[PDB]
Amino acid sequence: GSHSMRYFFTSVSRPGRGEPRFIAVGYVDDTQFVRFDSDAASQRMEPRAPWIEQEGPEYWDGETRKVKAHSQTHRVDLGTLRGYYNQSEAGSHTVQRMYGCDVGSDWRFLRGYHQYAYDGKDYIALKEDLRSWTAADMAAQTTKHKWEAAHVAEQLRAYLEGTCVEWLRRYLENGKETLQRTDAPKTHMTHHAVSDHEATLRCWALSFYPAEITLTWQRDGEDQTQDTELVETRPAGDGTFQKWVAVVVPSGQEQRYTCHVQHEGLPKPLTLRWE
Template identity: 40%
Template sequence: MGPVLAMGLGLGLQLGVLGGALCGPHSLHYFNVVVSEPSPRVPEFVKVGYLDGTLISRYDSETGRTVPRADWMAANLDQQYWDIQTQISQNSHWVARVDLETVRSRAHTWQYMFGCDLLEDNSTRGYYQSAYDGRDFITFNMDTMTFTAADAAAQITKRQWEKDKTVAERWKNYLENTCIESLKEFVSYGQAVLERKERPTVRVSGKEGDGFLTLHCRAYGFYPRPISVSWLKDGEVRDHETERGGTVPNSDGTYYTWVSIEANPGEKDKYQCRVEHASLPEPQLYAWETESNLVAIVAGVAVAMAVTFLVVVAICRFIMWKLKSGKASGPVRQRGTDGGSDSSATGTVWGWTGRPQVSLLPHGTHSNPGLWEGGTETPQAEGWGEGGGPG
């Protein structure tokens, strides 16, 4: 056992102490990609780690370093951890490069993914699967301790791995123990972010053509990822008639999905989109607001705004009239205390000092209208740390 492998296992088996009490569902996945013909913008090797769909780490052969991609991972794991992960990723890069050496006649891509899930009932599962040039190659069944080959070429690898019993044993140990322990610790670091709930925004639309009506129901901005979106007709689920899009991530860490169904235009009022999500206290139903309904709503809002505008204009005119009528009422006289001649002014009462003493505006108002009240984003000999795996 090499030093990198020993360090990876040693650290990995210590993980999970803080997160032992956490319940699922949670997942920890690592994705590795190697290409035979890299370019300036396409590194030869890339490895990324995801916890519950959130990017937590990244390594690529251009930078040569494993770095945290979540603030709470950087804050809780010291530089020694990331140095060890860098060594594991560099070893993974070497192994993946060797796997491609025999097929250098043209550009090729080797991908593999491994990880584990902690389910709601606290049970676990693990998996390893690989692909060659975008096609399934070989997968590992942890329950049967066997490998499944997707084609004739993969049969050679399958026979080699199953002949060497330690390959399956190493994968099983990693997926059942090290991976789950790592998952629990990482979740404890980012629990506030990972276990938040964000309500989906739902939009229903329709488009008629060729005698059919296609209804679309889109849900976006929700977290966590699991969601159920379905079409109902007269209150009954119509899954067999529904076309579904995948649940994909947004740049802000939330998710998006959609479903559509074809309907008879005359039966559009019978359809509803039902959405179930952890952020909702109960399933929500959404119907298509047709264009005529939308026009009526917009018209109603426009009328209300117009009425409000007219009321405001009328009030302003009334106030201006009151101000003008006050000035037009003529001078107000007050006899001086010395018994001399009267002094006069328009809009104010002048005392014997010749300075304005009392405003003619109604009590509680100001001459400035602005002051009025109310204005105002191949398992081999490499290290098996928590992010390395035996592959």
């Protein structure tokens, strides 16, 4: 199937004393593999997946060096943005950056991204062609001008199409035992009576990887979205994911309703019914 590598960075200013709280995390697909937390004792990029521990000291030195440079940039940004938006020193503010690449089933480059937000709102983002920028307002437009004159897009493109992909491949190989394994959802259905005339059917999927999944109901073979509730896909805590979808039905008509499950780890879509 398709794969991706993503890095997420959050910087939160600390008015009154010292530098921002800075937290960086790296993912391959839905598996976190590295982290840096400025509040932690080590001040190093740290492993969070076994297969990344295969990298030597030269890797850890370089990733620590880059990630600390990332944080210092965010630090300076928080002050610049304060100035751009005419804000005081009194409040805390947030900078977020996300970047990474997607590859298809052939592990060839599909798409790349690099986007940045201030206080939770779009600020500037590299467009799909990796050649120009989407700047949300006049502050971000000033930044676009800076980044154009420094050929930022050119550098990021080089990375997204080159390093990002080449290294995603390396990780997928090194971590194949789990990274290239799909875990099919483990499914079952529960029944609850709310009154004498109304029952709830809940269709569960558990223990699945990767996170992307589709759960739907049908009534007499027709799609049913009314009177259904679908929860946000959630982490189990052991690397796998969970989701359920429920439907409210007339008591005694349970047999009309079927739950349908699609997932990369299932060669055929799966059907469940209450009995």
